[PDB]
Amino acid sequence: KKLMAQIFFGPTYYQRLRHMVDDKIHARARGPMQVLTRQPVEGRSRDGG
Amino acid sequence: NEVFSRPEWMILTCLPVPPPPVRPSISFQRGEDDLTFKLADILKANISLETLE
RNA sequence: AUCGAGAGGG
DNA sequence: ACGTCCCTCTCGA
């Protein structure tokens, strides 16, 4: 079917940015443990809370 | 207070030595903790004065 | 690993 | 006198 609304359409220049979800995701349930505070540890890097 | 906070004890005669968990060491062969080094400096600053007097 | 400084992300 | 919450990187004793 057609669309009762027409659509504005052209080639706008876009750009990839440096944020990938797979680079951002992270999970943790028990895991690495700091030594003076005995709590979890900081960041996706060191895989923590 | 008659037991929990005498005033006479805002003067430190004996000193509490906190244990390793307060001031651990980490393998960097090791390497003690800011509060460890400081207390040797106190036990070096004390001794010298122990004998002077 | 620890502290110190630095750029970005909503 | 303390001076918004969290998060991802990168680098010098």
Contact A43, A28 (CB under 8 A): no
Which residue, among B29, A12, A34, has the nearest Cα to A49 in the 3D structure? Answer: A34
What span, in angstroms and rounded, lies between the C-alpha atoms of A29 and A48?
9
What span, in angstroms and rounded, lies between the C-alpha atoms of A28 and A25?
11
Distance from residue B20 (CA) to nucleotide D5 (C1'), in Å? 34
Using the structure block, give the residue that is written with the tokens 């244990």. B19
Residue type, A18: R
- How were these coordinates obtained? X-ray
Length of chain A: 49
Contact A41, A33 (CB under 8 A): yes
Report if CB A28 to strand D is under 7 Å.
no
Sign of CA dihedral A28, A31, A35, A37: positive
Give me the A residues in range 1-49 that sit within 7 A (CB) of strand C: 19, 34-36, 41, 46
What span, in angstroms and rounded, lies between the C-alpha atoms of B23 and B14?
20
Record the resolution, in angstroms. Answer: 3.0
Those residues with Cβ within 8 angstroms of residue A48's Cβ, 6 or more apart along the chain or in another chain: A28, A31, A32, A40, A41, A42
Q: What are the backbone angles phi and psi of residue A19, rounded to the nearest 5°?
A: -135, 105
- Residue B12 token pair: 């430190």
